[PDB]
Amino acid sequence: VIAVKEITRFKTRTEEFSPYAWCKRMLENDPVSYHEGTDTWNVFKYEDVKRVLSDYKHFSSVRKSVPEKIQITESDPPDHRKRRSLLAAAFTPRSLQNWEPRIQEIADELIGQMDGGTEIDIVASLASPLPIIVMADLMGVPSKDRLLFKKWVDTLFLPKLKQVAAKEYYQYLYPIVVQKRLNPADDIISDLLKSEVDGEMFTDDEVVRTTMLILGAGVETTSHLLANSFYSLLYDDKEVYQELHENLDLVPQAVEEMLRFRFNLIKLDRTVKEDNDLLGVELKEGDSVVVWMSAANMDEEMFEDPFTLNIHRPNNKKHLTFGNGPHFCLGAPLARLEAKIALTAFLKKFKHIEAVPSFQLEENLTDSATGQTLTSLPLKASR
Ligand code: HEM
Numbered sequence: 001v002i003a004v005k006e007i008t009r010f011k012t013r014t015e016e017f018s019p020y021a022w023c024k025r026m027l028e029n030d031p032v033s034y035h036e037g038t039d040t041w042n043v044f045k046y047e048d049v050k051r052v053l054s055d056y057k058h059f060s061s062v063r064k065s066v067p068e069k070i071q072i073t074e075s076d077p078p079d080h081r082k083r084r085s086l087l088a089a090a091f092t093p094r095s096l097q098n099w100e101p102r103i104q105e106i107a108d109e110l111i112g113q114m115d116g117g118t119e120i121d122i123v124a125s126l127a128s129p130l131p132i133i134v135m136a137d138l139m140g141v142p143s144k145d146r147l148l149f150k151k152w153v154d155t156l157f158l159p160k161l162k163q164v165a166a167k168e169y170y171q172y173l174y175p176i177v178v179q180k181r182l183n184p185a186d187d188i189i190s191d192l193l194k195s196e197v198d199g200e201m202f203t204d205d206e207v208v209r210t211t212m213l214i215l216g217a218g219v220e221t222t223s224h225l226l227a228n229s230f231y232s233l234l235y236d237d238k239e240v241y242q243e244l245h246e247n248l249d250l251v252p253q254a255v256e257e258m259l260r261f262r263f264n265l266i267k268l269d270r271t272v273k274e275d276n277d278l279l280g281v282e283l284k285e286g287d288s289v290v291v292w293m294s295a296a297n298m299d300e301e302m303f304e305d306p307f308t309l310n311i312h313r314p315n316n317k318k319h320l321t322f323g324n325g326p327h328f329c330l331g332a333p334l335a336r337l338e339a340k341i342a343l344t345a346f347l348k349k350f351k352h353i354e355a356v357p358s359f360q361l362e363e364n365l366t367d368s369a370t371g372q373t374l375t376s377l378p379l380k381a382s383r
Contacts, residue, residue, distance in 0.1 A: 002269055002290060004371050006038050013365035017372040019264050020307055023295040032279045041283060042290050046303075046320070048279055049296040052270060052289060054325035056080075059289055060273035061327060069200065070210050073327060076273075080326055082197050087210065088330060090191035096333050098186065099138060103338060106133050107345040114349075116381045119356055123376045127227040128158075130342055131219050139211055140176060140187040148172070156212070157219050159368055170208055177204045188214070218331045220368060222338055227374040229258040229343060234355050234379060236262070236309050243311075245347045254311040255339045260297045260319040261309055265371030267292050268323065293320040294371075350381035 010016045026033060026044045033042040043049050052059045056076050063074045072083045110129055114120050129150070136149045152172075155165040177189055181204065184190040192207050202210065233241045244250055272287040283289070297319045298306040304313060322329035329335070356378045365372040 002038050002040055002288070004265055004267065005367075007035050007040065007042060007290070008265070012362060013372045014361050016265055017361065017365055019294065019371075020298070023292070023298045024307065026292070026295055027299055032281055038288075040288050040290050041279075041281075042292060043279060044292050044295040044299070046296040046299040046301060049291040049293060049320055050324050051278060052291050053268070053320070053323055053327070055278060056326055058272065058274050058276045058278060059270040061270060062273075064271045064286065064288065067206055067209065069202070070206055070213060072213075072330075077326065082200065084326075084330065085197040086195045086200065086202065087192070087214075089195040089197075090188045091330055091334065092191075093333075095191065096337060099134075099334075100337065100341070102137055103134055103341050104345075106130060106137065107341050111345045111349055114381070116350060116383060119378045119380050121376045121378050122230045123223075123227050123374055126342060126346070127223045127230070127374070127377070128154075130226065131222040131338055134338060135215055135219065138188055140180060140185060140189045145172070153215060153219060157215055159366065166212075169212070173208050173211060174204060177207045214331075218335065220373075221370065222331075222335045224368065224370055224373050225255075225258060225263060225335060225339055226342055227377055228262045229255070229339060230353075230377055230379070231374065232258055232262045232309065234353060234377075240309070240311065241347075241353060244343070245351060248344050248347060250311060251340050251343050251347070252336070253316065255336055255343070256316040256319065257309060257311045257313070258339075259321045260303070260316050263297075263321045263370070264294045265292070266294050266321060293323070296320050346381075350383045352382040354380045354382075356380060 004016065008016060008019070008022065010019070015022070023044070031043075031045045032048065033044070034040070035042055043052055060076050061074055062076055068075070069083060069086070072080065072087060075083055107130060110126055114125055132150050132153050133146060136146055141149050152165040152169040155161055156169070177193070180187070180190045181193045184194070189207060189211065192202055192210055195202060240254065244254060268291050270289045270291070272283045272285055272289060275282065275284050277283070297303070300306050302318065303315065322332040359378050364375045364377070366375050
């Protein structure tokens, strides 16, 4: 995969975490931008990004070791639609409905273990554990084996140790999969075993591997959102916290704004499949495209005062952090839900938060698939 850093040439981790300067420059000076080093055409404007992602005919997701029945992301029509549906049966609204109380409890539990005398590391205490545990419980891992699950997860999805983890994971999970085919429950594994689209169904092996792709998709990213939300409430605009506390009805909207403004730096790759000029330039088959959804989320043509955090900007929900078109994130309702709940619960308990002057950002960022991610975020909370 094309690495962010090669295109960006950022001196600091902090700048990759808060790239507002660069995004403005690219949006205004070089919106459709060839990068020789990576031989990559780089797309920044909302309208263009939106249209590249929607126009799969011309911008294919087929890449330039995984049973293609479960290769959803790296597939075009007509295959993609069927591969998506087999999974989507495990993420119905009903299931989100059902999952809320379970997710509620997991959150309460974790907020419980935070007091507010000592400094809290939100990352270790909430950002990382919540989605992992939620997946664990939502899939069908029993409560006691959670720590073992985290262990395989951290190893596999937080950047030979993995070889081991995979196998333990696989042989831990395969039995359970086999068990649940026989004795269904209300969970993802069970949902996925009953999934049938145009006759096709999942093999047990495919269900197991599907759970790995799910975790692959939805732990790093949700966790990044969470850590980042908190970073924002500490550093970006300190009034927001107090605003949210007094009116919890606003937390969803604030989540969209963290998705818009604070999920840096996310991109996607496509490959040109049929020659075209949709970006006002002729691209040819095999040309690689990279769309910078973080930048598009800061395009003034779409969002007013885009370089300011504003949770009341009425169109924040139109951000492209979850992509756009056929591949639009299947787990967005879940990620949104987890964050709503995680944030509400914490707001409901603590009244104020505060930064810690020792803590330096540079020292607590590492490379992730979505540009710099927080290793720890220490704060102090009251109540
Ligand atoms: C903040 C959290 C998340 C973000 C920012 C995020 C972002 C994205 C993005 C940008 C894509 C599009 C990839 C592409 O167009 O090639 C995507 C696809 C996907 N996401 Fe997520 N995602 C998140 C959470 C989740 C979760 C929690 C799950 C599952 C539990 C999930 C499952 C998927 C799947 C299955 C796809 C493939 C969709 C397809 O190709 O049909 N995501 N996500």
